[PDB]
Design a binder for this molecule. Structure first.
Ligand SMILES: [Zn+2]
Ligand SMILES: [Zn+2]
Ligand SMILES: [Zn+2]
Ligand SMILES: [Zn+2]
Lengths: 48, 209, 179, 97, 114, 60, 170, 328, 97
């Protein structure tokens, strides 16, 4: 990872524009749930 | 069978229409969605010893911005397209004064013919397409993401924003199926937008070189 | 693998193989599966009926008596039809030794040097455990016919292929044989 | 983005545990009416979303890159920090928010 | 389907055309002997290759100590109660675990399947 | 692993012998030799191998 | 209603088709013009094909062979009686429908057998033991992963396919 | 169906071998093909490669000098009937015939009409052969083949028909696509291969539809078939997916295969590492294997390339061409 | 034969299903038989070392032994050992403990 937050090799060729497509390291992340994917439309409207 | 080959011609015409729409040319909506029965009514029902003889399937299309771009498509009669057939097609290209064309070969053309396509390349753009390749649209596959062709000003703005040279971009070959579908050439940059598992959306730029 | 009862002739092995019918060609498709033999100190393979005729058995009925022990079994003869057709153009015994003698370690300058060299290969280096001297070539024909007969039984599926990891098929070289 | 309806997604900040921590720190009583305004919730979520920066710059390409990089986390944040769930489920106060 | 040899030099006879009498003949390739063909068929192969394995069972297997033997099925000719049984006992034998029965009686050897 | 092995407790390795008395006994008890054989008799007779060498046939 | 023609092949096919209808004396039994019926069949075949080529010839010969055979007599009876119209009889789709009842029965039975011939893939393990806690259905499969290691022991993870519920063996 | 998994599958994906051990297509179906097992069987027969040996019961060369001789006791009736009407054939004919019998179990299974087979064996070769055939009423289902009617107008004949008979059993395609040996059928019990649709009420619903699993890869022809789903049909062969669809598609496919071979064991790895590996493999527009032939053909320095695999040959080439080293 | 298998395949599948169901049932009975003071159960429940299949193999049934993912092959002529009789496909002959 270079200082433009791009991921480059020794030839300075761009492999990824951001690391992991989001620019986040792998230590601070956790499994979560969206809670907006797969309720029915009526239930989603009532809940939100 | 004859019905199978009629279906083959209809499906390959639909793929040509989708390709011409995706390349930026002007096609009608009903031309985009033709049914098998409508195609049979328009062109004939039995192509063997019958009306649709692979000659009347040539299509006139023009670009949206410029009405004089005037790209054609051609369906050669013989399965093995040669220098004689390509010379006839290029001479015809010369009197109707157009610059770009597609050739839909049945199975394959001769190496001398495909070299003559390279020799004729600067003045006239000739692209080889097999009938097996065009039997389905590869851009509708779930593996293939969306490809957008970038303009020169957009490429210049991109390289100025990221402070990059053209060498440092990822590459895509000119013989790539998507590259040949879009008719892209060397030096142009294609823009790929794909869904991301971690960030939702990710945009990748690839140089055709 | 054949040895002269652990007294001399350290390594002497023979391969009798049946080539596959998957070969793509006009000649390959018509014949079927031929049977070939690989002999020691010979550069390339030899057809199996050439070796039998080189031992002095000229008529193919005498060849098939040593290979097939019951002529009333019909399925056995179709596996040896292309072997006879491949070796059809050689009929005389000394021609067969000339055929084998052309494929030695070095080709002989004279023809009779090749025939003499092919004869001593079939005496000394061809199955030494059966015999080495004089009229043991008659005993060599039965064992060579037995090897072909065992090859046909595995090809017909009437016997199971031998597995190499069976340790009854192994011998232990102790200090005696080692020294 | 997600066919087959799979909701288990790896994301940096654990918003449910952060809400629980806020409830325990600020002694939130879930059986009393709150003093948190939904407009304050919406404006705070918007101003927080403007502060999670991955790609800098005011170029349109930079703005598109920022939106694409922070899309999934912003969707999760707006879903779990919405005004109805703040009023009815978590019942936070202004200081806790 | 069978192979017949020459009666002069004991070589293999080959089938060939008799173009005037319009009859199949077998002739030796190494001499001039010719023999009229009675079967009038030359080449045949059974692709499914279904064969009765009872012809491939030697009657001597009744003396094997390792084969199992049963008492429920008697022999058909001599009516002996004891008889050994075994499976197909060969490779490329398609898919069947069918038992083959051999009577273990002296001066017998009748073979039957069930 | 699996390439270096040890003998069992009561396992014994044969030391070797000469097949001449066995050949003499076999010849004295029938065992028609391959020189005196007719090829029609091999079908219904048991083949006899001594140290891997086919020496004759037998009928009992 | 048979349009006559001067083609030798056409009239010869008509007369073999008539002689095919002569088999079994069912034309005597019914009382129908077998020559006119065969001419009608041949005319309908010529309308279908518009040629005297291979498809014309082998279609005619297939109809002749399906007429003269003795194991399917009621087909000839229904053709001569008028139960099967001639224009339909010209276009019967080979033996899938122009057949006797026993051949159709064994074709259906072997069509049911080639179900069991070519499913394969050995997909389901067929547990059918654990009852679900959400949809209460026992059609489930189990998973054996995470062998040995420091902490995690082998715990069977069972999934119900119909409702998607997953519950640990515990 | 057996699938290679673990270290050998990982080695295949990393090396990008041109011949995997078990290359397969999952094939999805459209319309009523996905619901009716009869129509799915029709698609099965359309895709599976069928050689004439698979439908032939047994084959025999007879010698009938006369078409009215008929040394076979049963064929005399219809063989006259095709000689009652001599069609497209000179009555002068060679006396050597080849008659085959076709098994009924393998006939209705693959849904071939014998009229179609006689068309395929003739039009595939041309006017060089003659075939006379039956209807299926007889319990012995017979097709008899003769040589040139016009030859009599080397190689002999018996050798020639044996050369013909051994070629029909090997490489004559009657149905299906070659390099596809055997294709299966199953209703998927896992939501990964089931069809996921969003209902009108808005909840995710899984539908059981028939899918096909093959052995061998022809992705171009399978996708070009009218009956499959073009959107969702995919293989596990990296090179054919590349050459058919493109570099982005093969990057996504490589990511999917790596995730499958990792998560089959129940283990989990973060997405960033798989994404980085796939991006490094597909960065330069072609499949760059993690081998000497993939790594040492890059634009990296000679000192980078000498520490991996071939050490001295790299320095030979660099000294011969005078290649500088930027030392990054 | 079961859908999509030969006679050998369906026979081996049926016998392996019977043996695996027997091993699972015996293991479930053995695990139900354990008291609350059982040290094996303490070790397994804590997750420090051991597993339920280890408990089952200690107490009730070791189970079927497999070589190359398959039941014990006939290394001799159509028998696994000289102590067994020829063409014996029973559980004792083919390696079920
Ligand atoms: Zn002769
Ligand atoms: Zn008896
Ligand atoms: Zn699940
Ligand atoms: Zn004949």
């Amino acid at each position: 990872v270079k200082y433009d937050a791009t991921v480059r090799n020794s030839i300075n060729q761009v492999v990824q524009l951001r690391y992991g497509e989001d620019g986040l390291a792998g230590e601070s992340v956790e499994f979560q749930n969206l809670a907006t994917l797969k309720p029915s439309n009526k239930a989603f409207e009532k809940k939100f | 069978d004859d019905e199978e080959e009629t279906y083959r011609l209809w499906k390959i015409r639909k793929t040509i229409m989708q390709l011409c729409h995706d390349r930026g040319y002007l096609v009608t909506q009903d031309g985009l969605d033709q049914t098998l029965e409508e195609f049979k009514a328009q062109f004939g029902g039995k192509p063997s010893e019958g009306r649709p003889r692979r000659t009347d399937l040539t299509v006139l299309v023009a670009h949206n911005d410029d009405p004089t771009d005037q790209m054609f498509v051609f369906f050669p009669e013989e399965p093995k397209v040669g220098i004689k057939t390509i010379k006839v097609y290029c001479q015809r290209m010369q009197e109707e004064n157009i610059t770009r064309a597609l050739i839909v070969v049945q199975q394959g053309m001769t190496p001398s013919a495909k070299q003559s396509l390279v020799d004729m390349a600067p003045k006239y753009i000739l692209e080889q397409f097999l009938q097996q390749e065009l039997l389905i649209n590869i851009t509708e596959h779930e593996l293939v993401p969306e490809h957008v062709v970038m303009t020169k000003e957009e490429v210049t703005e991109l390289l100025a924003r990221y402070k990059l040279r053209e060498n440092q971009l990822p590459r895509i070959q000119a013989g790539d199926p998507v590259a040949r579908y879009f008719g892209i050439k060397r030096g142009q940059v294609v823009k790929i937008i794909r869904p991301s598992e971690t960030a939702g959306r990710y945009i990748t730029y690839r140089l055709v070189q | 693998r054949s040895c002269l009862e652990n007294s001399s002739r350290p390594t002497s092995t023979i391969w009798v193989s049946m080539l596959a019918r998957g070969g793509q060609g006009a000649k390959k498709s018509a014949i079927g599966q031929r049977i070939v033999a690989t002999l020691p100190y010979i550069k390339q393979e030899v057809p199996i009926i050439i070796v039998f005729r080189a031992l002095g058995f000229v008529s193919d009925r005498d060849i098939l008596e040593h290979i097939i022990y019951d002529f009333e079994d019909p399925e056995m003869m179709e596996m040896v039809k292309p072997s006879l057709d491949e070796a059809f153009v050689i009929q005389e015994q000394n021609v067969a030794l000339n055929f084998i003698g052309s494929r030695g370690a070095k080709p002989g300058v004279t023809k009779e040097k090749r025939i003499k060299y092919a004869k001593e290969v079939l005496q000394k280096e061809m199955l030494p455990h059966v015999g080495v001297s004089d009229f043991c070539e008659t005993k060599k024909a039965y064992f060579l016919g037995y090897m072909v007969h065992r090859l046909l039984l595995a090809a017909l599926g009437r016997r199971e292929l031998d597995d190499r990891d069976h340790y009854g098929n192994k011998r232990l070289d102790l200090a005696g044989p080692l020294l | 983005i997600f066919p087959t309806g799979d909701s288990k997604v790896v994301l940096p900040c654990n918003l449910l545990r952060m809400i629980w921590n806020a409830q325990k720190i600020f002694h939130i009583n879930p059986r009393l009416p709150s003093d948190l305004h939904p407009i304050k919730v919406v404006e705070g979520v918007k101003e927080l979303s403007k502060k999670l920066v991955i790609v800098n710059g005011d170029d349109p390409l930079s703005r598109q890159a920022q939106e694409n990089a922070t899309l999934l986390f912003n969707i999760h944040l707006r879903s779990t920090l919405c005004s109805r769930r703040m009023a009815e489920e978590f019942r936070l106060s202004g200081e806790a928010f | 389907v069978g192979i017949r040899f020459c009666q002069e030099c004991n070589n293999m006879l080959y089938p060939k055309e008799d173009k005037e009498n319009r009859i199949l003949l077998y002739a030796c390739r190494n001499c001039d002997y010719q023999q009229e063909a009675d079967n009038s068929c030359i080449y045949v192969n059974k692709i499914t290759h279904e064969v009765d394995e009872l012809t491939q069972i030697i009657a001597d297997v009744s003396q094997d100590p390792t084969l199992p033997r049963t008492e429920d099925h008697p022999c058909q000719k001599c009516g002996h109660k004891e008889a050994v049984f075994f499976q197909s006992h060969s490779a490329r034998a398609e898919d069947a675990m069918r038992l083959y029965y051999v009577c273990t009686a002296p001066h017998c050897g009748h073979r039957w399947t069930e | 692993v699996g390439l270096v092995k040890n003998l069992a407790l009561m396992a014994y390795i044969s030391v070797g012998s000469q097949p001449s008395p066995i050949l003499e006994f076999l010849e004295e008890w029938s065992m028609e030799n391959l020189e005196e054989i007719s090829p029609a008799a091999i079908a219904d007779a048991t083949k006899i191998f001594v140290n891997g060498c086919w020496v004759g046939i037998h009928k009992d | 209603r048979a349009p006559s023609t001067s083609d030798s092949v056409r009239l010869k096919c008509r007369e073999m088709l008539a002689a095919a209808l002569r088999t079994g004396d069912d034309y005597i039994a019914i009382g129908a013009d077998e020559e006119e019926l065969g001419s009608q069949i041949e005319e309908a075949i010529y309308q279908e094909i518009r040629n005297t080529d291979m498809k014309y010839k082998n279609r005619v010969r297939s109809r002749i062979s399906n007429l003269k055979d003795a194991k399917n007599p009621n087909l000839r009876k229904n053709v001569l009686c008028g139960n099967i119209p001639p224009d339909l009889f010209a276009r019967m789709t080979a033996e899938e429908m122009a057949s006797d009842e026993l051949k159709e029965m064994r074709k259906n039975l072997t069509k049911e057998a080639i179900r069991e011939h070519q499913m394969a893939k050995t997909g389901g393990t067929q547990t059918d033991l654990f009852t679900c806690g959400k949809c209460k259905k026992k059609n489930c499969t189990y998973t054996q992963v995470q062998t040995r290691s420091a902490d995690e022991p082998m715990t069977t993870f069972v999934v119900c396919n119909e409702c998607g519920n997953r519950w640990k063996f515990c | 169906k057996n699938v290679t998994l673990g270290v050998p599958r990982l080695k295949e994906l990393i090396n990008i071998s041109k011949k995997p051990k078990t290359p397969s297509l999952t094939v999805f179906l459209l319309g009523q093909s996905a619901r009716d097992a009869e129509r799915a069987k029709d698609i099965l027969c359309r895709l599976e490669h069928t050689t004439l040996r698979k439908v032939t019961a047994n084959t025999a060369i007879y010698y009938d000098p006369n078409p009215q001789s008929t040394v076979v006791a049963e064929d005399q009736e219809w063989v006259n009937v095709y000689y009652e009407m001599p069609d497209f054939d000179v009555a002068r004919i060679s006396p050597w015939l080849l008659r085959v019998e076709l098994d009924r179990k393998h006939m209705t299974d693959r849904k071939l009409t014998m009229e179609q087979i006689a068309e395929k064996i003739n039009a595939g070769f041309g006017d060089d052969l003659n075939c006379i055939f039956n209807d299926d009423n007889a319990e012995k289902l017979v097709l008899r083949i003769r040589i040139m009617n016009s030859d009599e107008n080397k190689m002999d004949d018996d050798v020639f028909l044996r050369c013909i008979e051994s070629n029909m059993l090997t490489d004559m395609t009657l149905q299906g696509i070659e390099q596809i040996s055997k294709v299966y059928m199953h209703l998927p019990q896992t939501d990964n291969k089931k069809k996921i649709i969003i209902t009108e009420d808005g909840e995710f619903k899984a539908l059981q539809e028939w899918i096909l699993e093959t052995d061998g890869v022809s992705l171009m022809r399978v996708l070009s078939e009218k009956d499959v789903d073009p959107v969702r049909t995919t293989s596990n062969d990296i090179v054919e997916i590349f050459t058919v669809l493109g570099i982005e598609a093969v990057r996504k496919a490589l990511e999917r295969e790596l995730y499958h071979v990792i998560s089959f064991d129940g283990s989990y790895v973060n997405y960033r590492h798989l994404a980085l590996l796939c991006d490094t493999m597909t960065c330069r527009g072609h499949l760059m294997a993690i081998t000497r032939h993939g790594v040492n053909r890059q634009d990296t320095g000679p000192l980078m390339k000498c520490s991996f695999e071939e050490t001295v040959d790299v320095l030979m080439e660099a000294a011969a061409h005078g290649e500088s080293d930027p030392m990054k | 034969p079961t859908p999509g298998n030969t006679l050998r395949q369906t026979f081996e599948n049926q016998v392996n299903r019977i043996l695996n169901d027997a091993r699972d049932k015996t293991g479930s009975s053995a695990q139900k038989s354990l008291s609350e003071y059982n040290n094996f159960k303490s070790m397994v429940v804590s997750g420090a070392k051991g597993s339920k299949i280890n408990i089952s193999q200690v107490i009730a049934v070791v189970g079927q032994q497999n070589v190359e993912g398959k039941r014990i092959p006939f290394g001799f002529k159509h028998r696994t050992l000289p102590h067994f009789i020829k063409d014996d496909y029973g559980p004792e002959s083919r390696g079920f403990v």
